[PDB]
Amino acid sequence: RTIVVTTILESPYVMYKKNHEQLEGNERYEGYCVDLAYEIAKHVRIKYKLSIVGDGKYGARDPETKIWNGMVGELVYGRADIAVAPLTITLVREEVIDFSKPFMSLGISIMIKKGTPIESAEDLAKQTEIAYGTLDSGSTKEFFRRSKIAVYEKMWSYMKSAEPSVFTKTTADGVARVRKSKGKFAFLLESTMNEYIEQRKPCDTMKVGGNLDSKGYGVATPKGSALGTPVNLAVLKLSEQGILDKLKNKWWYDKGEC
Numbered sequence: 001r002t003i004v005v006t007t008i009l010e011s012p013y014v015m016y017k018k019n020h021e022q023l024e025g026n027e028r029y030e031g032y033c034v035d036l037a038y039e040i041a042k043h044v045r046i047k048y049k050l051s052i053v054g055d056g057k058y059g060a061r062d063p064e065t066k067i068w069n070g071m072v073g074e075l076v077y078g079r080a081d082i083a084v085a086p087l088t089i090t091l092v093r094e095e096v097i098d099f100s101k102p103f104m105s106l107g108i109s110i111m112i113k114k115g116t117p118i119e120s121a122e123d124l125a126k127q128t129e130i131a132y133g134t135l136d137s138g139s140t141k142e143f144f145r146r147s148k149i150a151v152y153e154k155m156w157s158y159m160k161s162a163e164p165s166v167f168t169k170t171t172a173d174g175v176a177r178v179r180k181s182k183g184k185f186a187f188l189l190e191s192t193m194n195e196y197i198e199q200r201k202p203c204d205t206m207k208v209g210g211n212l213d214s215k216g217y218g219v220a221t222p223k224g225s226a227l228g229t230p231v232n233l234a235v236l237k238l239s240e241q242g243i244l245d246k247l248k249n250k251w252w253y254d255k256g257e258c
Ligand SMILES: Cc1onc(O)c1C[C@H](N)C(=O)O
Pocket: 010, 058, 059, 086, 087, 088, 135, 137, 138, 139, 140, 141, 171, 188, 189, 190, 193
């Protein structure tokens, strides 16, 4: 019947259409993941309903209750059948949900307000004047928390006990902080987002240095779900036909402003 697709409000993946308040259902949203959801549904041949995840989080297991939140939690506890969003494929998640092969490749990167004297992770680690942070409850924070690499262990030790907190609830909050910090706050987010922001007015931020790692985003389904196989082949098909590239051009560069 109708599949529940959990996703998250994160531009340019999923955003409200200009006149969304006068709309209903899937028509309220637009973006890369909305188009991707549409393309996959066509191949897997299913009817679906997009649902912005309640807590607005990507997904992490609370060390306390051991309960999964975010979109990951929606799949784990059976409140959603599929998740189409910029959800990073990681080991801890692979253990509780299934991931299609990646539909996009990326890595953790550094975002600075233009003019900031920072060109690498090493630069951030060896100073204290400029504060930095990452999104809360996601793969990026876990990367730093788990790294055995000196430079990253150093950054984690600083972010872990920063006051006030340097962990934001959304990508937008991180970006806003970078913009109003007048160069005193750098943000650590995936290259896809960093690249998108650089191309959006007021064009006051930029990605510096190369990525810190290499990974990908995958369409996720509950562990053992029957949709896993069809969805994975659909992702590969769309990759082969260059549809995924068309969509990146559409939502990133066709709409550039800098
Ligand atoms: C998007 C995005 O951009 N930077 C990030 O850390 C994220 C969230 C990350 N893709 C996750 O799945 O947790």
